From a paper:
We report the 1.8 Å crystal structure of Cass2, an integron-associated protein derived from an environmental V. cholerae. The structure defines a monomeric beta-barrel protein with a fold related to the effector-binding portion of AraC/XylS transcription activators. The closest homologs of Cass2 are multi-drug binding proteins, such as BmrR. Fluorescence assays demonstrate that Cass2 is capable of binding cationic drug compounds with submicromolar affinity.
Numbering used by the authors: -6 to 119, 123 to 149
The structure:
């Protein structure tokens, strides 16, 4: 896969607030290229939100409001800590809670690296830990490095 898989680490993470665009989807909708929503969500973010970011802006992909488990619907939120629901129209503010997470990290071509990192997440949980299905997140640490933090019970 031509990725550097840095590995996984369990840790306590401090909560934080982020604002951005939300869409509701399912894994099945995302697997079908013709019905996927996450790509379009990010294009909207690039279009409407990116021009308003700063050099210290942190950018995230939140997965939250889970209907059930990985087989159910969930909200995906393309967002950033420096945006606010009134510096940006149609946006929603979410608080990610402090808690215990398992965090995975990889570096490579984007977005290949985030797609493939989710596969590592899948393999791992499908296990010493159980998913909380509260709020999980991609953190786009740099142009080539992404972390995925999964909330665990």
């Amino acid at each position: 896969e031509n990725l550097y898989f840095q590995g996984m680490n369990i840790s306590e993470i401090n909560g934080f607030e982020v604002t951005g665009f939300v869409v509701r989807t399912t894994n099945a909708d995302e697997m079908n290229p013709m019905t996927a929503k996450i790509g379009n969500l990010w294009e909207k973010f690039y279009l409407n939100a990116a021009p308003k970011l700063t050099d210290k802006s942190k950018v995230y992909g939140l997965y939250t409001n889970y209907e059930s488990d990985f087989t159910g619907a969930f909200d995906v939120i393309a967002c950033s800590d420096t945006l606010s629901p009134q510096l940006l129209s149609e946006s929603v503010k979410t608080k990610v809670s402090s808690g215990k997470y398992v965090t995975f990290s990889a570096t490579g071509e984007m977005p290949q690296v985030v797609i493939d990192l989710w596969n590592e997440v899948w393999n791992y949980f499908a296990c010493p830990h159980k998913r909380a299905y509260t709020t999980d997140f991609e953190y786009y640490k740099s142009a080539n490095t992404v972390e995925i933090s999964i909330a665990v019970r």
